[PDB]
Amino acid sequence: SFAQDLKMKQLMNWCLIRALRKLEIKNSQNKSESRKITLTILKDFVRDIRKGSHDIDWXXXXXXXXXXXXXXXXXXXXXXXXXXXXXXXXXXXXXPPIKLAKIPNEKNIQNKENAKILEEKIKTIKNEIEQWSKDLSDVKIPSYELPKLTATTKESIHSDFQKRVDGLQETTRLLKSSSILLNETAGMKLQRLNGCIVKKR
């Protein structure tokens, strides 16, 4: 069974292998330089591990300030707390505790981006609205639209009929008068041709 240091690096370095690999199948989107980069750092990382980087396994650190409800201490004499090595000729409490290099988050980024997005979008929108109101009240252009017997008469027919009656009437007067003057002629002729005889016998 055991709980050994080598087998820890067997299993762990194995998980690192599989992790790299999976992340290489996930590197189908190569144009993301983040991907190529991260892969370089992680390959050189697993290499620098398998070929040593510094002291590694087991031990702890210092714990600094505690944080446990199970914190309860009780001891006695027999070797006090003063702890460190010594003896060997040639070659300190040993306290290099934890060290941190904090990294920002992700929601900060999504909120930066989304902020930019909503700023430019809402800008374009409110400006579109400007164009609407102004063009409406202005260039509406009221569509303006604004509009703007022959040769016949009583006297003519009565003049025709009267003309006929007058011409005819005049011709008639000419015939009748001709007969009158005629019988006045014959009249005379006989007035002097009726006294020649008288009569006598």
């Binding site: 762990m12 990294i103 639209e145 019988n183």
Partner: protein, 196 residues
């Protein structure tokens, strides 16, 4: 099976020295200037969740001896995680909500403008600028709309006068023939001297 016993301090120690190395190198492929958006910082995250995958996978063929089996391992990976960052910056997230609801509202506004504004403009014209039907239908509404006797008797008396002339000349055309005959006989009797 295989069985690697862990203590919280062991696994957290390994994690923290991994982060030590990763920090050491990320500090050679780039200077310290942080905050870069889709670049640099995306790498940091990708490496975090990378260690999530690595260590989670590790706990499958490996157990803990502090609580029950491989329980809490992810809670301490995630407690050292939170020991970094992700303070949900309330103010920026508040800006996110403000500008998101503002985005929705302004959107609805431009929509109801794109329709309501043209349609109401054209409605107002089409309604007033149809007053041609005052003129036109005024029109089409209108298009549907629902002593001489003396003189006569005088020309008549002229006709009757001509008729009189007719009868008179007809009675006087025989008489003058007869009196003719008489006077021509007489004229032939003067040459003969009209005696006894």
């Amino acid at each position: 099976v295989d069985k690697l016993d862990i203590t919280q301090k062991q696994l957290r120690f390994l994690h923290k020295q991994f982060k030590e190395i990763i920090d050491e190198k990320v500090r050679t492929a780039l200077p310290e200037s942080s905050e870069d958006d889709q670049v640099s910082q995306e790498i940091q995250l990708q490496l975090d969740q990378f260690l999530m995958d690595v260590l989670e996978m590790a706990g499958e063929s490996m157990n803990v001896v502090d609580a029950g089996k491989g329980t809490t391992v992810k809670s301490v990976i995630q407690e050292v995680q939170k020991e970094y960052t992700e303070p949900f910056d309330v103010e920026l997230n508040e800006k996110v909500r403000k500008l998101y609801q503002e985005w929705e509202d302004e959107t609805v506004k431009v929509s109801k403008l794109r329709r309501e504004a043209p349609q109401v403009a054209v409605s107002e014209y089409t309604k007033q600028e149809n007053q041609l039907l005052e003129e036109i239908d005024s029109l089409i509404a209108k298009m549907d709309s629902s002593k001489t006797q003396e003189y006569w008797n005088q020309v008549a008396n002229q006709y009757g006068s001509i008729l009189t002339s007719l009868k008179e000349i007809n009675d006087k055309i025989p008489t003058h023939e007869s009196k003719q005959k008489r006077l021509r006989l007489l004229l032939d009797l003067i040459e003969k001297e009209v005696a006894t």
